[PDB]
Each structure stands twice: as structure tokens, then as C-alpha cells.
RNA sequence: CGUGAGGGAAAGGUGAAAAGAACCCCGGGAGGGGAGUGAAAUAGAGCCUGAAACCGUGGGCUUACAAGCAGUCACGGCCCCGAGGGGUUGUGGCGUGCCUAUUGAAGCAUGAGCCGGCGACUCACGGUCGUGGGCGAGCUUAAGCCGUUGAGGCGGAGGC
RNA sequence: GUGGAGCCUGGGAGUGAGGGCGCGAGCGAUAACGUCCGCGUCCGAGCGCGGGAACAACCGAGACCGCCAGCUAAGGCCCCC
RNA sequence: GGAUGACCCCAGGCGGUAGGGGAGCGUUCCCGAUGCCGAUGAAGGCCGACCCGCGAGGGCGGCUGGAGGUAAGGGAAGUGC
């Protein structure tokens, strides 16, 4: 008997098609364009889903700097004091304090350079 | 009065009332849970070494779930590699009931 | 209420005519009939009956006033190309496209 | 000369990019001012024949 | 294919494809790649495996209790109604497929027409049509014969 | 709980005397007031560091041989078209320029970037037009 | 099409029924708008379904100091559906198409305008191993014959 | 020494254009992104990730998936970063 | 662990071209079928931010469509661009 194509095809493309809706020209338009563009954004989902964790660490870090700098020291030394401290509280965290929660990152600064 | 808690590898800011996705705990829903604390801030400071030995934070489950599937896709130019994956990560709701400082 | 007209199947090349289309949307029917009448392209003669195709449509079917009627909305999709060769140097036969133009008008009234 | 040819299609966007200044300007028209038929200025009125006051054409 | 063998253009310089005669699996219209030609399905299945698969399939009907011999069939000398009739009377409703199995010419006209009856000769017993009815019904003669076939 | 992002904040202006500082080692003290990092809530997609007043630019100063040595380079895109202007020159000519173009080199490019060095005012002279602004006098 | 031998296409479908749209209106006509038919008329004859590339109208968001394999991650603005989602995209981070062939390609090396459809590891007979079963010092039938008319059996010649 | 170790019988391959680097030689000119062998490595197939401005084979390190958590490696800590 | 592939627990492996192997999805057709779904709407098309599945896919819903379709379990190939 014979199998033609049929419907399978049309419905392959209309999966990818769909998934590149938002893509510029033949890219959301052409299927073939669209699986090209779709591969690239895998890959950059990928990859840029291992690097936020990276973006954001940044980003607390400059944060808890300039905090750190408002009560004479610096990042390096502060965290320094926090291990010597046994203070575990996590970048996010501290971060999140220099800036809602003046007061306790103050302490928090205090415990580490006495702890030093 | 906030607590720092660490569930799961990773720390969150609670405040009583407030609803949270954390990893998953093995806990029946409608269960309550005693997280640990690292640091209780709000009217009164005190700060964990690394938690502090009196202190939990209450939270009472509301449910296990799963997270939006997210594609995990790999790609290799020119070497016909290519695979797809669907992923959704197991979580559990907690609402957060009191600070017992 | 709307009164409509469409010349299906006229010879011209969309991208003509719906330049003239264009200087007509959205104006009275009276300014679209000094437009049209003073524009210098073989599309205002299409243009320009189904503009008054229309507007008899608007008067005499849909109960609407000829001093009140706008072109509410106006357009041209393209029919069927006819295709023609184009016989050319060295034995090569080219395609020319006569293209077609399907011209939609349509009134409304523009109120008090 | 060496045939030259378009290296790559023209996408959408550029080509109704290009056609950004193809626009008609409509008719410059004023009133006849004795029969007031729309008609173009310096023009004998094509309605009425008239031009600069008198009847200039049987119309 | 009914195309000519006559390359379509020359092999090089057209700015075309190279291409030969359009008999070629790869035109539209062209010849079919591996497609079906006239195919003999049939194969020799031991005659011990037919033998001993006859055998089984009754035997499963039999441990169902789905068998029932018959010594004769009544009043059945034709007519759908008689052996309907009798049919009623030997437990068979016609809820349940029967094969009908029996070398009375008789029964079987009387029988074929029933939806729920397929109905052979002994010698034509066979494992599809026992494993395809739900119950089985034979003439001692046909039993007779099936015994004679198994053995 | 996700990074907290600052509403819009009214921006501070700062006043900064370059008199006898080191160009460069003024620069980045600048670099890093415009953008933002000090501040506790610095965010990097957005415009939230100070502007910067700097008065006696003109009075900068420069370690080495530098005033003969450093040349200012402009491309003009013609042929023969690379103008090479040295420190001295510049200073003498153009000073404000002696800041702006060190401080510019070490902000972010791109649009943002582009902003942040706007929001840097540069005067030769001890005097500025900002009063309206009252810039907070910065030792740095 | 070719002097000729010869080559050699495309092209199916209204509806149950023509009831295939009287008559009026605009128009030279084509075409349309009403009226009418029909269960349905974007089933109106250029007729079932009616995908995609392609062209347009209308709306939402956006864009004229900006540097780009066109995405991706993040945040913010606006719009929409109603501790959530969806659309859009300003800024910031990251980021060298696909296939092919190569020691090595984003590569300034091949192929591809885009889309739809067609399009390439099969079948017979032998072999070899593996495997699911049957029988086992044995296993097996071929052609044919009888039967059936989608019923199977007989046939030991022969083969291992 | 229990390892995606080893040995034996069998079924199926693909490969039989390699390349850079280090070390040991020959050839070349104590030339080549040169050539030809040996030991090793990597790329090939890890054009996946960090560093090296960028960059297959240099340094770091073998990517099953997810995290807005932690510690490190080479390399870095004046600003771009 | 329990007895057996029910599922739980602990541990370890899981970059990959040529290529070996395994397990699946879907297309046409046959048995299942004198059956079953179907005008209270077949197939097909267009949507979907929902459900299941690692995935290929499979559901469910709305609109279109207007007459076919076809299960569990098996079978066979003109089977996937
Ligand atoms: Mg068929
Ligand atoms: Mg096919
Ligand atoms: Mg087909
Ligand atoms: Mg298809
Ligand atoms: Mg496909
Ligand atoms: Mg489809
Ligand atoms: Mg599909
Ligand atoms: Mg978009
Ligand atoms: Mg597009
Ligand atoms: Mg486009
Ligand atoms: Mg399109
Ligand atoms: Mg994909
Ligand atoms: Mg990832
Ligand atoms: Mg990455
Ligand atoms: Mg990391
Ligand atoms: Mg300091
Ligand atoms: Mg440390
Ligand atoms: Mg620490
Ligand atoms: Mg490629
Ligand atoms: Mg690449
Ligand atoms: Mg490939
Ligand atoms: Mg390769
Ligand atoms: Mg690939
Ligand atoms: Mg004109
Ligand atoms: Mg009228
Ligand atoms: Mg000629
Ligand atoms: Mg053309
Ligand atoms: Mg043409
Ligand atoms: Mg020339
Ligand atoms: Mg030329
Ligand atoms: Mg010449
Ligand atoms: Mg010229
Ligand atoms: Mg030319
Ligand atoms: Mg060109
Ligand atoms: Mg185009
Ligand atoms: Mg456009
Ligand atoms: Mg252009
Ligand atoms: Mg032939
Ligand atoms: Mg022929
Ligand atoms: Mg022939
Ligand atoms: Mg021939
Ligand atoms: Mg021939
Ligand atoms: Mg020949
Ligand atoms: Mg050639
Ligand atoms: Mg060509
Ligand atoms: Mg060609
Ligand atoms: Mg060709
Ligand atoms: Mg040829
Ligand atoms: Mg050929
Ligand atoms: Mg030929
Ligand atoms: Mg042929
Ligand atoms: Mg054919
Ligand atoms: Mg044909
Ligand atoms: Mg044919
Ligand atoms: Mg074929
Ligand atoms: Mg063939
Ligand atoms: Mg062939
Ligand atoms: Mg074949
Ligand atoms: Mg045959
Ligand atoms: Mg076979
Ligand atoms: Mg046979
Ligand atoms: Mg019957
Ligand atoms: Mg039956
Ligand atoms: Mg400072
Ligand atoms: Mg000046
Ligand atoms: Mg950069
Ligand atoms: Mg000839
Ligand atoms: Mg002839
Ligand atoms: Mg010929
Ligand atoms: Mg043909
Ligand atoms: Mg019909
Ligand atoms: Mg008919
Ligand atoms: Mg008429
Ligand atoms: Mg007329
Ligand atoms: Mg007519
Ligand atoms: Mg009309
Ligand atoms: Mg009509
Ligand atoms: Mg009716
Ligand atoms: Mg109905
Ligand atoms: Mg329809
Ligand atoms: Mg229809
Ligand atoms: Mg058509
Ligand atoms: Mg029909
Ligand atoms: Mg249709
Ligand atoms: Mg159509
Ligand atoms: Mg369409
Ligand atoms: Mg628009
Ligand atoms: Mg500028
Ligand atoms: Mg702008
Ligand atoms: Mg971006
Ligand atoms: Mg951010
Ligand atoms: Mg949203
Ligand atoms: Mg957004
Ligand atoms: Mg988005
Ligand atoms: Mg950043
Ligand atoms: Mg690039
Ligand atoms: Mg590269
Ligand atoms: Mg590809
Ligand atoms: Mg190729
Ligand atoms: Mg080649
Ligand atoms: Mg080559
Ligand atoms: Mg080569
Ligand atoms: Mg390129
Ligand atoms: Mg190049
Ligand atoms: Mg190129
Ligand atoms: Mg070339
Ligand atoms: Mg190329
Ligand atoms: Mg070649
Ligand atoms: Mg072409
Ligand atoms: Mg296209
Ligand atoms: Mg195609
Ligand atoms: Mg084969
Ligand atoms: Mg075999
Ligand atoms: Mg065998
Ligand atoms: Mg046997
Ligand atoms: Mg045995
Ligand atoms: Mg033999
Ligand atoms: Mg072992
Ligand atoms: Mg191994
Ligand atoms: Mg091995
Ligand atoms: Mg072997
Ligand atoms: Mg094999
Ligand atoms: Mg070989
Ligand atoms: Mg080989
Ligand atoms: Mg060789
Ligand atoms: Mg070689
Ligand atoms: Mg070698
Ligand atoms: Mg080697
Ligand atoms: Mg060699
Ligand atoms: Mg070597
Ligand atoms: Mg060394
Ligand atoms: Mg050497
Ligand atoms: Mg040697
Ligand atoms: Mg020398
Ligand atoms: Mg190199
Ligand atoms: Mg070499
Ligand atoms: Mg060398
Ligand atoms: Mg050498
Ligand atoms: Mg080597
Ligand atoms: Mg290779
Ligand atoms: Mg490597
Ligand atoms: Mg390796
Ligand atoms: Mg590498
Ligand atoms: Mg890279
Ligand atoms: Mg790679
Ligand atoms: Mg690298
Ligand atoms: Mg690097
Ligand atoms: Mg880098
Ligand atoms: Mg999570
Ligand atoms: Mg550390
Ligand atoms: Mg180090
Ligand atoms: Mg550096
Ligand atoms: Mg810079
Ligand atoms: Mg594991
Ligand atoms: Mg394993
Ligand atoms: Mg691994
Ligand atoms: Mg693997
Ligand atoms: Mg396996
Ligand atoms: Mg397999
Ligand atoms: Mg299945
Ligand atoms: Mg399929
Ligand atoms: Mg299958
Ligand atoms: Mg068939
Ligand atoms: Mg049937
Ligand atoms: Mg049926
Ligand atoms: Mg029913
Ligand atoms: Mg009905
Ligand atoms: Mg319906
Ligand atoms: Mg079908
Ligand atoms: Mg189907
Ligand atoms: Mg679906
Ligand atoms: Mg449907
Ligand atoms: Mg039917
Ligand atoms: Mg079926
Ligand atoms: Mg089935
Ligand atoms: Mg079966
Ligand atoms: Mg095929
Ligand atoms: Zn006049």
C-alpha cells in the first residue's frame, strides 16, 4: 500500500512555525529560516540559563561593594570577615539587606571586622 | 520581623503570610515544616553562626508542583547533533506561617 | 450602516491603482469625487466608478444619504495574473504578468 | 560591463522602505467662482467655461 | 514508464541540473524506486504446526466449555428459521459467534445467513476460524473427521 | 524573593576640583560616580549615577613626559586624514577636552553609556554654571 | 515541438435537487449592491475542503544619535486576558546562519529566492549468523492432486 | 589492582586525506602555518564552558536536566570589567 | 529490599563525528469489524497561555468543515525531507 506524505509535513513545519512566532521576516515566516533561528536560540537559551546564575552573582557583588564602602571597607575584606565570622548568609542575601535592610547590613559589617 | 531561612541549597527573605516556592520537600501537603535560620532582622537583629539555635520559621505546605516546561535544546553545527529535551522542575509551595525567633 | 462596492477582475496592476485608492480613504465622498476626478492616472476611472457604484448602493439599497456618505474603508487585492510571453533576444521568452486588481469602496455616514 | 545583478533579494521591509516617497499629492483644486465646481487654479472652468470673469468656452 | 530514454538537455553548460531521461524516480511523472511488484505472501508452515495448532485451538474452546458436540440437527432441512429453531433450543441465542461445523449440506444453508454463524465442512476446519468464534459446534461425523485430521 | 530594582530616583550632582589631581587616576573616581556604583541599588541598564561637575580642568595634571609625548589622535576619514595632537597642545587649546576624553574611554559603549557621559559637565576654570543644581562639593 | 523518424504535456469535484439567482439599483460592459433559491451562497458557476509561500486593509506595541547570523537571558514601559499569563520591545549582558566537504568554515569554499507537493537502502532466489517456535536420529516436502471459493488437506519424488 | 578492566567464540561496522603542540631525530638553510619518522598530548569527534583582546588544537577543565545558592581552576582585582 | 519489572532505597555512569546496539513515535493498508464512533457533526483545516509524554507525539477545547472514521492487540509496507 502506498503512504504518502499527506498531513505529516504541513504539520512538522506548523510545530516549528510556530515556536518562532516574534522572529524577524522569512525567520517566523519561511520554515527553514525558522528551524535555523529556532537552533541558535536553543543553544543561547542554554547556555544564557547558565550564565544569569553568573549575571545576578555579578550583580549582588557590586552591590554589597558599594554598601561595604559606605562603612570603610571593601568587598574582598568584607567577605574575608563574614568566613572568619562563620556568617553564611549568601550574596543574594546580602545584597538584598544593603539595600531593604540598612541597619542589619551595618551590623553585619560590624561583625566583620571584628571578626577579623 | 523577617527571618533568612535556607531551604534547598538556597536562602530565601520570609516574612509571616507570605506564599514560596522552594525545591521539594518530602512532606505531605497540608503538613507544616521547621526551616532553619540564618539571621532574624525586622525590630530586633540577630544573626546566625551560621543559624542561629533557637530560631525557625513555621511554614505549613500547600502543595508539590511542577514548573513551566522549559526546552532544554542542544545544537552542534554541522555534525547532525541535536537533541531535544522538555524539563519542569519539581517544586512545593509554603506558606509561611511564624518567625519562632 | 455601510454600503459596499467591488470591480472584481480589473485589468490593471494593483500597485497602479491602489495609489489612487490611497489619495481617496477616508474622505468625503464629494472631495473623493474632486480627487479622483482631477487625478491624472488610469486607475481614477476605476477608482472612480466603484466609488459611485458605492455611493448608488449607500442611496438606494442601505437607506443612507448621499451628503453624509465618507469612504469608510477602500482597498485593492489582486486577482489572477494573465500571463504573456515576452519573446526576447536569443530564442529567450520572457513572462510578462498582466496583473489584475480586485477594488473594493466602502461608505459609511459621517454623523451630524 | 559585466552584467550586474541584485547579490541578494530585497527583504520586505526594504523594498516599502524604498516606496516611503511614492505617495500621491492629491489635486490642487480651488472653487470656480462663478459656477463653484472644484477645478484646478489658472484653469478655464471646465464646468462652466468660465475664466477670469467671462465665458471663455462652451462647455 | 512510457517516456523516451532521450537525455533531456546536455550535461553541462544549460545552468541546469544535470538530468538524463525523465523516466528518472526523480521527476514528477517518473518511474517508482522499490515500489510493489506482484508478490507471492504464501509460505510451507510445518504440517506438524498446523496439526498441532488445529489440535490447540480446539482444546481451548473445549477447556472454555465454548465446545459442543452434536449427534444430528433436528428439524433443520434448510431453512434459516429450522435451524434457528434448533438453535435456540441447543443453547445458541446468537449472542455468541458460532463456527458451525458440520458435512450436512442442510445444516449449513440453513445456518450461513446468520451474522453470528461462519459455517464450514470437517475437512475444512481450521485454526483462524476457531480462534475467530467464540464458540464451536460440530456433528460427531465432523468430530469424527477432526480426530482423524489431529492424529 | 527577586533582586530588587530601584523606582526612578531623583539623580545627585556632584562638584569635583580637578586642580593638581592625576587625569587618569581622577577619571576613574568619575567613571564610577556616573555610573552608579556606588550606590547600593546600582543597576546596570538604567541611567542612576551622579552628574558630575568638574571646575579647573584646565589645571590637571600629568606624570612622565606626557604634556610633550601624549598624542590626541582624530581620524577624518579622507585620505591623509589622521590629526595628531599633543597633550600640551590640547590643554592649551581645547583643556576641558584633556578630562572628557579620559573619562569617555572608560565608560560602557552603547546607548547607556553614551548617556552617562552627558551627564558629565567639564569646565576649565575654577567657576560653573550649575548653582541652580547646588552640586555637593566631593573630595575624592 | 520537430523536415522527418520521433518527442509529448496540462487539464477531475456547485448542490440532495438547478431550485444556475425573475425584478430593481450603479456600470458601456466586466463587476458589484439589493431582491430571490438553498440546510448552507467566503456551496454563485473564476463553484467541495481550501494549507503555505506571496499581496493588502484595520488594530495593539514599537522605532528617526543607531553598529545588526537578528536571537537569547534580565529588568523596566505600554497594550490585552483575567501574588498569574499573553503581545510588544527600551536599556543591559551574551552571541561567527544551515547543509556539505575538510586537517581545519561565519567563513571571501559547495548548495539553497520562498512555499507546497514528488523525491533515494527494496524485492526474489541462494547464503551466513542471530533469534521465536515445531519435531528431534531425524527433520522436511517440490511439482502436482483433491477440496474450498479469503478452508484446508493429500503428495516422500527429492533435500539436509 | 573489580575496571564501560581482561581473555575466548561469534554478528555488525567505520577507518585506512589527518592536524597543531611538546620532547627525540632525519630531510631543509641550527627557513616555512615546511617535510618525514618516534614517544606523548590535544583538535579531529570537546568550533561545548573559563582564561589567552579576538582565535580547532597554549593555560584551566571533560557540558545528563533545573536553581536570582556555595567553593575553586587558569587568569585576574585603576575604569571599560 | 519484593521476589522476579509492581515500586522504594543507596551508589555509580551518562561530551561526542564515522559507526555498533537498544527502546519508541507517527504515515498507508489488513485482521479485530455484519462490530464500534459519526449530521447532537467523520476526515481534513485554523487557533489554544490547558492536560499527558524526555522526545517523536498523544489528548482536550473553540472555530472551520460537511461524510466519513476506526480501538485494545496483532499483521504488512510505495512509511517521515
Ligand atoms: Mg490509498
Ligand atoms: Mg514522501
Ligand atoms: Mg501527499
Ligand atoms: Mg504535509
Ligand atoms: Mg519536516
Ligand atoms: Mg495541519
Ligand atoms: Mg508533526
Ligand atoms: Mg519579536
Ligand atoms: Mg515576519
Ligand atoms: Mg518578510
Ligand atoms: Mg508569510
Ligand atoms: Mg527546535
Ligand atoms: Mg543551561
Ligand atoms: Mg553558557
Ligand atoms: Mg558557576
Ligand atoms: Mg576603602
Ligand atoms: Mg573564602
Ligand atoms: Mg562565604
Ligand atoms: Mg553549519
Ligand atoms: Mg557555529
Ligand atoms: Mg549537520
Ligand atoms: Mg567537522
Ligand atoms: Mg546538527
Ligand atoms: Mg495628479
Ligand atoms: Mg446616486
Ligand atoms: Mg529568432
Ligand atoms: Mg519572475
Ligand atoms: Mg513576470
Ligand atoms: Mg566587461
Ligand atoms: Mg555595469
Ligand atoms: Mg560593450
Ligand atoms: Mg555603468
Ligand atoms: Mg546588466
Ligand atoms: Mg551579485
Ligand atoms: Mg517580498
Ligand atoms: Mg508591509
Ligand atoms: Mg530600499
Ligand atoms: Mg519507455
Ligand atoms: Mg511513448
Ligand atoms: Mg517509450
Ligand atoms: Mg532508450
Ligand atoms: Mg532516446
Ligand atoms: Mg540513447
Ligand atoms: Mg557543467
Ligand atoms: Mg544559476
Ligand atoms: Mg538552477
Ligand atoms: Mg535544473
Ligand atoms: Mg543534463
Ligand atoms: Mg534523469
Ligand atoms: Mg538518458
Ligand atoms: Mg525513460
Ligand atoms: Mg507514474
Ligand atoms: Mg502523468
Ligand atoms: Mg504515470
Ligand atoms: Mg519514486
Ligand atoms: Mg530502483
Ligand atoms: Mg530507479
Ligand atoms: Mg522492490
Ligand atoms: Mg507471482
Ligand atoms: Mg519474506
Ligand atoms: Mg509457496
Ligand atoms: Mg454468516
Ligand atoms: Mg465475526
Ligand atoms: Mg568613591
Ligand atoms: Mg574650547
Ligand atoms: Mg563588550
Ligand atoms: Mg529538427
Ligand atoms: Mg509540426
Ligand atoms: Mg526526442
Ligand atoms: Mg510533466
Ligand atoms: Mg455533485
Ligand atoms: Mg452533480
Ligand atoms: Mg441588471
Ligand atoms: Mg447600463
Ligand atoms: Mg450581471
Ligand atoms: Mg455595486
Ligand atoms: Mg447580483
Ligand atoms: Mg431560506
Ligand atoms: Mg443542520
Ligand atoms: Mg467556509
Ligand atoms: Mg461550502
Ligand atoms: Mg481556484
Ligand atoms: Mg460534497
Ligand atoms: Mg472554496
Ligand atoms: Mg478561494
Ligand atoms: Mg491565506
Ligand atoms: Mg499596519
Ligand atoms: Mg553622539
Ligand atoms: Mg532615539
Ligand atoms: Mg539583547
Ligand atoms: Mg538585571
Ligand atoms: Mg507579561
Ligand atoms: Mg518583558
Ligand atoms: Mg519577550
Ligand atoms: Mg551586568
Ligand atoms: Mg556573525
Ligand atoms: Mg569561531
Ligand atoms: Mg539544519
Ligand atoms: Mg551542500
Ligand atoms: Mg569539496
Ligand atoms: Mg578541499
Ligand atoms: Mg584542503
Ligand atoms: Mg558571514
Ligand atoms: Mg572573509
Ligand atoms: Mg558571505
Ligand atoms: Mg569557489
Ligand atoms: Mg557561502
Ligand atoms: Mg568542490
Ligand atoms: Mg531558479
Ligand atoms: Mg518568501
Ligand atoms: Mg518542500
Ligand atoms: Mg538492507
Ligand atoms: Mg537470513
Ligand atoms: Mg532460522
Ligand atoms: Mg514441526
Ligand atoms: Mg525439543
Ligand atoms: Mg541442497
Ligand atoms: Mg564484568
Ligand atoms: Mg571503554
Ligand atoms: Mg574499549
Ligand atoms: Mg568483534
Ligand atoms: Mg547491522
Ligand atoms: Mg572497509
Ligand atoms: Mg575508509
Ligand atoms: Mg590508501
Ligand atoms: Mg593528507
Ligand atoms: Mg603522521
Ligand atoms: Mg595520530
Ligand atoms: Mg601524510
Ligand atoms: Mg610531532
Ligand atoms: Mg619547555
Ligand atoms: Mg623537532
Ligand atoms: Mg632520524
Ligand atoms: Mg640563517
Ligand atoms: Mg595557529
Ligand atoms: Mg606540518
Ligand atoms: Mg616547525
Ligand atoms: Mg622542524
Ligand atoms: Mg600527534
Ligand atoms: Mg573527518
Ligand atoms: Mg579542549
Ligand atoms: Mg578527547
Ligand atoms: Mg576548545
Ligand atoms: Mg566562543
Ligand atoms: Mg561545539
Ligand atoms: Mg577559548
Ligand atoms: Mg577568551
Ligand atoms: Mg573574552
Ligand atoms: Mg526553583
Ligand atoms: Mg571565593
Ligand atoms: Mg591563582
Ligand atoms: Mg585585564
Ligand atoms: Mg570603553
Ligand atoms: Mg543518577
Ligand atoms: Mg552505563
Ligand atoms: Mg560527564
Ligand atoms: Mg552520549
Ligand atoms: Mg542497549
Ligand atoms: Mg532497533
Ligand atoms: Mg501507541
Ligand atoms: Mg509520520
Ligand atoms: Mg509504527
Ligand atoms: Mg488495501
Ligand atoms: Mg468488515
Ligand atoms: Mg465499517
Ligand atoms: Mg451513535
Ligand atoms: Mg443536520
Ligand atoms: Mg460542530
Ligand atoms: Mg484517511
Ligand atoms: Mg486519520
Ligand atoms: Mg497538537
Ligand atoms: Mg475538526
Ligand atoms: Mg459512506
Ligand atoms: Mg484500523
Ligand atoms: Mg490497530
Ligand atoms: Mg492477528
Ligand atoms: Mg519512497
Ligand atoms: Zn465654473
Not at chain 3, 476611472?45 to 449607500?58: I, R
Request: aromatic share 6%; proline share 6%; glycine share 8%.
Amino acid at each position: 500500500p502506498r503512504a504518502k506524505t499527506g498531513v505529516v509535513r504541513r504539520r512538522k513545519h506548523k510545530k516549528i512555525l510556530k515556536l518562532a512566532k516574534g522572529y524577524w521576516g522569512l525567520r517566523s515566516k519561511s520554515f527553514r529560516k525558522a528551524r535555523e533561528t529556532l537552533f541558535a536560540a536553543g543553544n543561547y537559551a542554554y547556555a544564557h540559563r547558565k550564565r544569569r546564575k553568573r549575571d545576578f552573582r555579578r550583580l549582588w557583588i557590586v552591590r554589597i561593594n558599594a554598601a561595604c564602602r559606605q562603612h570603610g571597607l571593601n568587598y574582598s575584606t568584607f567577605i574575608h570577615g563574614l568566613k572568619k565570622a562563620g556568617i553564611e548568609v549568601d550574596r543574594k542575601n546580602l545584597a538584598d539587606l544593603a539595600v531593604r535592610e540598612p541597619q542589619v547590613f551595618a551590623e553585619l559589617v560590624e561583625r566583620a571586622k571584628a571578626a577579623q | 520581623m523577617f527571618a533568612i531561612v535556607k531551604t534547598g541549597g538556597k536562602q530565601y527573605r520570609v516574612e509571616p503570610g507570605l506564599k514560596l516556592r522552594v525545591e521539594k520537600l518530602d512532606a505531605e501537603p497540608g503538613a507544616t515544616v521547621e526551616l532553619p535560620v540564618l539571621l532574624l532582622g525586622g525590630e530586633k537583629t540577630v544573626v546566625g553562626t551560621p543559624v542561629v539555635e533557637g530560631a525557625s520559621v513555621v511554614a505549613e505546605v500547600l502543595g508539590h508542583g511542577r514548573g513551566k516546561k522549559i526546552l532544554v535544546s542542544k545544537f552542534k553545527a554541522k555534525v547532525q547533533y541535536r537533541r531535544k529535551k522538555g524539563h519542569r522542575q519539581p517544586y512545593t509551595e509554603l506558606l509561611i506561617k511564624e518567625i519562632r525567633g | 450602516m455601510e454600503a459596499k462596492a467591488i470591480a472584481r477582475y480589473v485589468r490593471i496592476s494593483p500597485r497602479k491603482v491602489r495609489l489612487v485608492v490611497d489619495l481617496i480613504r477616508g474622505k468625503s465622498l464629494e472631495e473623493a469625487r474632486n480627487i479622483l476626478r482631477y487625478t491624472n492616472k488610469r486607475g481614477a476611472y476605476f477608482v472612480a466608478k466603484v466609488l459611485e457604484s458605492a455611493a448608488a448602493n449607500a442611496v438606494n439599497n442601505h437607506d443612507m444619504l448621499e451628503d453624509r456618505l465618507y469612504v469608510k474603508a477602500a482597498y485593492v487585492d489582486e486577482g489572477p495574473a494573465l500571463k504573456r510571453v515576452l519573446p526576447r533576444a536569443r530564442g529567450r521568452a520572457d513572462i510578462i504578468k498582466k496583473r489584475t486588481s480586485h477594488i473594493t469602496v466602502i461608505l459609511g455616514e459621517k454623523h451630524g | 560591463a559585466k552584467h550586474p545583478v541584485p547579490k541578494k533579494k530585497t527583504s520586505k521591509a526594504r523594498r516599502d522602505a524604498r516606496r516611503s516617497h511614492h505617495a500621491l499629492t492629491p489635486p490642487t483644486l480651488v472653487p470656480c467662482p462663478e459656477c463653484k465646481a472644484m477645478k484646478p487654479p489658472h484653469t478655464v472652468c471646465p464646468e462652466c467655461g468660465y475664466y477670469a470673469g467671462r465665458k471663455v468656452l462652451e462647455v | 514508464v512510457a517516456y523516451s530514454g532521450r537525455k533531456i538537455w546536455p550535461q553541462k553548460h544549460t545552468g541546469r541540473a544535470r538530468h538524463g531521461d525523465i523516466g528518472a524516480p526523480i521527476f514528477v511523472g517518473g518511474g517508482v524506486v522499490f515500489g510493489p511488484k506482484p508478490r507471492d505472501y504464501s509460505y510451507t508452515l510445518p504440517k506438524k504446526v498446523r496439526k498441532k495448532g488445529l489440535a490447540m485451538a480446539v482444546a481451548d474452546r473445549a477447556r472454555e466449555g465454548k465446545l459442543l458436540l452434536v449427534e444430528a440437527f433436528a428439524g433443520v432441512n434448510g431453512k434459516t428459521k429450522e435451524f434457528l429453531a434448533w438453535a435456540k433450543e441447543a443453547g445458541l441465542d446468537g449472542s455468541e459467534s458460532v463456527l458451525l461445523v458440520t458435512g450436512n449440506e442442510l445444516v449449513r444453508r440453513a445456518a450461513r445467513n446468520l451474522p453470528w454463524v461462519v459455517t464450514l465442512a470437517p475437512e475444512g476446519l481450521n485454526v483462524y476460524d476457531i480462534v475467530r468464534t467464540e464458540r464451536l459446534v460440530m456433528d460427531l461425523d465432523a468430530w469424527e473427521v477432526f480426530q482423524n485430521r489431529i492424529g | 524573593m527577586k533582586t530588587y530594582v530601584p523606582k526612578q530616583v531623583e539623580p545627585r550632582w556632584v562638584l569635583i576640583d580637578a586642580e593638581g589631581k592625576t587625569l587618569g587616576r581622577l577619571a576613574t573616581k568619575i567613571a564610577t560616580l556616573l555610573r552608579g556604583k556606588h550606590r547600593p541599588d546600582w543597576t546596570p541598564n538604567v541611567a542612576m549615577g551622579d552628574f558630575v561637575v568638574v571646575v579647573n580642568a584646565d589645571k590637571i595634571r600629568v606624570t612622565g613626559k606626557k604634556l610633550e609625548q601624549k598624542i590626541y589622535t582624530r581620524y577624518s576619514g579622507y585620505p591623509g586624514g589622521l590629526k595628531k595632537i599633543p597633550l600640551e597642545k590640547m590643554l592649551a587649546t581645547h583643556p576641558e577636552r584633556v578630562l572628557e576624553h579620559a573619562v569617555k574611554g572608560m565608560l560602557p559603549k552603547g546607548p547607556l553609556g553614551r548617556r552617562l557621559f552627558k551627564r558629565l559637565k567639564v569646565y576649565a576654570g575654577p567657576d560653573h554654571p550649575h548653582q541652580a543644581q547646588r552640586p555637593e562639593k566631593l573630595e575624592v
